[PDB]
Design a protein around this ligand. Structure first.
Ligand code: HEM
Ligand code: HEM
Ligand code: HEM
Ligand code: HEM
Lengths: 146, 141, 141, 146
């Protein structure tokens, strides 16, 4: 979770244009659509039989909101992602039991959504900056597994 | 395994790429070298800087191979059999790196086709790139 | 993909297992539940304690499915097609967990067949269990 | 890298019966045999065309020795595997460039070798104890990647 000031400026500037309300649900939804097994952890959200149903499901965009909440929260604490997530770590690890391999998946789909929305402005250098961050957030959550 | 809907989704999305295939191929490679440095170790003889003509000309190769895959989807194993030996027998490419490339191919496609990248086509492409990955690493499996 | 040597290696090694298949199946499951707790979430309705008759009777199922695979190796996809739907459609088992089980199956085999576990047969079994994994997760792919 | 004293006694007792000279090469060799791509990092060790050649290759058993060296070294420092490996971490990460996914593989094959040699004495509980350790060693080496 180093980040050169050059990278720091890319993540920040870009993240400040993000429609938090939509993006969080764009990712959560796509996760559940592209990696079906993940649907197992959201059986209570209702109908998820088709992508259409999933993307329109209010429980989804509502949760995505929170999920995105965590990233921005972790984004302004790169100095210590580990502690910033202790709570959620205990939550997803020794409670929900989500295999840490799925944290990488949400981080990658999150990244695909960012590329989908910003298009050209989402250059390779900017992407590599985000991969580090997404990688740091995924490691932080899996900590309680060690 | 690719349902009739996936095949239809992949052919259409690739279609919208048209003559940009080669360009897009070079973009995914670049995205991969910067995001995942651990993959650069396979291209010592390449200049990985931005405008590299080597990375440019290589992207065309990668793109044309996917094009071969999309137009022979019902028989990738045989069609790409050749590339399998080269990636598993000679080069000995770590299987994990195929996931990293597949990911970069998706960020690229999504960054050039805002209208066609619906979640349905997104899942479709992923399954497809996964099939291409399985075949290219079968001389291992 | 399984070379004629792998097929021969898998049939022979499974042979040496004989009537212990069922027992060995229950052992791999137990090894997996303790080593990788994150997999226990799929068996709420099971008593995962040591002598569990449920884990005992389930191991036979797992073992008999592999036996089905070894004796129909040239056509696993069709032979296990049924189990594919059940693991991908209904249960929605995380693909990663198949690697964890495969690993436990190997530690078990190796802990009961010191003579047959040569590095050649070791690679053979791994390729085989990988093929069984690919098929069981194909309704995903 | 917690380890209950019950687990501590299993790993220790068992590890003290291990033929360090043979085991290290039994694993390294099997790694190169079962996961071929790994052969890419040992092109200088000579002939590795067949398992026979690989298992008999003197450079292999010679390296396995050292590799096993690290585990025992990390085994008597579970309290801080992270620092115990900083050097090797820099080595395999920003120098050799080995994808951290392969550290899990060596740890698992190492475990298969231990099961091969101790047979029945290598009970499920003992295995789970080692999986934690092997997991802790693999995370420690990949640290320089974060
Ligand atoms: C990139 C890592 C992830 C982040 C940042 C993240 C963040 C969060 C947050 C903020 C919450 C809500 C906490 C609260 O309401 O107090 C949460 C809950 C939850 N997360 Fe995640 N999460 C991640 C990955 C995942 C993945 C991959 C799954 C599994 C498919 C998952 C499953 C859940 C579930 C089921 C809940 C809901 C619990 C409930 O119903 O109250 N999360 N997550
Ligand atoms: C699905 C993705 C992939 C496809 C379709 C693909 C396709 C190709 C093709 C068509 C060639 C060149 C054939 C020729 O010119 O004779 C090639 C070469 C090569 N590929 Fe890939 N490849 C893929 C993934 C990878 C990955 C993951 C790596 C490693 C990170 C890799 C490393 C190489 C190397 C080193 C060469 C040789 C380049 C040279 O020396 O000129 N490839 N690939
Ligand atoms: C290659 C390995 C695997 C094989 C051959 C296999 C085989 C089987 C078979 C034959 C059945 C029962 C069929 C029946 O009785 O109708 C089954 C059920 C099941 N399997 Fe697997 N399985 C494998 C891996 C897994 C993994 C990785 C998990 C998750 C960690 C898993 C979770 C389940 C569950 C929950 C059931 C239903 C059990 C019940 O509710 O009674 N399986 N499997
Ligand atoms: C479980 C993690 C591993 C441990 C404990 C480990 C430990 C070591 C040790 C102790 C050395 C020798 C250092 C010295 O001589 O000063 C070394 C060197 C090396 N390791 Fe590993 N290693 C691990 C995994 C791997 C893997 C998976 C690969 C990649 C296939 C790898 C590739 C290398 C190479 C090529 C060298 C030799 C460098 C030379 O030629 O001098 N290691 N490792």
């Amino acid at each position: 979770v180093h980040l050169t000031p050059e990278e720091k400026s890319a993540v920040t500037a870009l993240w400040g244009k993000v429609n938090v309300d939509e993006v969080g649900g764009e990712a959560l939804g796509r996760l559940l659509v592209v990696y079906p097994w993940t649907q197992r952890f959201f059986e209570s959200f209702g109908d998820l039989s088709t992508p259409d149903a999933v993307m329109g499901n209010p429980k989804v965009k509502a949760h995505g909101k929170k999920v995105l909440g965590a990233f921005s929260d972790g984004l302004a604490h790169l100095d210590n992602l580990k502690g910033t997530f202790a709570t959620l770590s205990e939550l997803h690890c020794d409670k929900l039991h989500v295999d840490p391999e799925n944290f990488r998946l949400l981080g990658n789909v999150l990244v695909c959504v960012l590329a989908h929305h910003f298009g050209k402005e989402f250059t390779p250098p900017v992407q590599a900056a985000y991969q580090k961050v997404v990688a740091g957030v995924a490691n932080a959550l899996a900590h309680k597994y060690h | 395994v690719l349902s009739p809907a996936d095949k239809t989704n992949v052919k259409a999305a690739w279609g919208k790429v048209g003559a940009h295939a080669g360009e897009y191929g070079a973009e995914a490679l670049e995205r991969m070298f910067l995001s995942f440095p651990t993959t650069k170790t396979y291209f010592p003889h390449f200049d990985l800087s931005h405008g590299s003509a080597q990375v440019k000309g290589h992207g065309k190769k990668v793109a044309d191979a996917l094009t071969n895959a999309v137009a022979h989807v019902d028989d990738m194993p045989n069609a790409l059999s050749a590339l399998s030996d080269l990636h598993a027998h000679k080069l000995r490419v770590d299987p994990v790196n195929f996931k990293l490339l597949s990911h970069c191919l998706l960020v690229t496609l999504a960054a050039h086709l805002p209208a066609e990248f619906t979640p349905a086509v997104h899942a479709s492409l992923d399954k497809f790139l996964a099939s291409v990955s399985t075949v290219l690493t079968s001389k291992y499996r």
